[PDB]
């Protein structure tokens, strides 16, 4: 589940104190709850944040 | 491809308002019958149109959804000529920064270089990679460049020539989830190391 991972690397991001991969994960989380994006593009952004908070 | 182009968004660069650039890669293209079109990835609308700027194309909007690719055509009338699909987070250029100052402390035998971005005050792109480049002025293409993430570069005494002028000047690039490329460069800030 692509909403289960969002929920995930928005609790990470906070631990980490990276305020802008919180607001990242909660923005495409909310764009896809609104069907705004596809569930593809919100994939690919978590992809990104994930690899930003491996960093 | 006959109608090859490139593109830079600037985002927050107007208060929330963000901005695209596209340029023909090669110069002498004859723009006169070229239009461009920016359709998806938008908040409430399908398509915006470009103004044309004497040689760019330019839009200043809030209406970047910033998730999602776009894709950005070349017309002429109704008639598309070539498309790219561009993701505007991959092709952000910063602001470049600005108040650079050098000064050297003869406690430390060390040159503290700083320097302001606005993009400490943005939501979006607030984390940048710099590059502090100096040089002795008499040389041409012996550039030593440094890179660093905060907006302080302490540099030796001792890793400069003495009694010598330099010139130094810093540019960034987004280092995040936002990637893209090189800012403009800010002013030259000229100083003189120590005799000793």
């Given at each position: ?48 944040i994930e690899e930003v908070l491996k960093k | 491809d006959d109608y090859s182009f490139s593109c830079y968004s600037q985002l927050e660069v107007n208060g929330s308002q963000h901005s695209l650039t596209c340029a023909f890669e090669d110069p002498d293209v ?167």
């Open positions: 589940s692509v909403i289960e991972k969002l929920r995930k690397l928005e609790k990470q991001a906070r631990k980490q104190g990276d305020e802008v991969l919180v607001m990242l994960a909660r923005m495409v989380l909310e764009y896809l709850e609104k069907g705004w994006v596809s569930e593809e593009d919100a994939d690919e952004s978590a992809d990104r | 004859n723009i006169t019958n070229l239009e461009f079109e920016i359709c998806g990835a938008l908040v409430e609308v399908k398509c915006l149109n470009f103004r044309k700027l004497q040689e760019i194309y330019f839009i200043e909007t809030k209406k970047f959804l910033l998730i999602g690719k776009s894709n950005i055509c070349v017309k002429v009338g109704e008639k598309s000529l070539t498309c790219k699909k561009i993701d505007l987070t991959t092709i952000v250029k910063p602001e470049a920064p600005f108040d650079l100052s050098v000064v050297y402390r003869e406690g430390a035998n060390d040159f503290v270089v700083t320097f302001n971005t606005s993009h400490l005050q943005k939501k979006y792109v607030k984390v940048l990679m710099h590059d502090v480049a100096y040089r002795q002025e008499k040389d041409e293409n012996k550039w030593t460049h440094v890179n660093l993430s905060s907006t302080k570069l302490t540099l030796l005494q001792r890793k400069l020539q003495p009694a010598a002028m330099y010139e130094i000047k810093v540019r960034s690039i987004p280092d995040h989830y936002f990637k893209g490329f090189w800012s403009e460069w800010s002013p030259s800030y000229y100083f003189r190391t120590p005799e000793i």
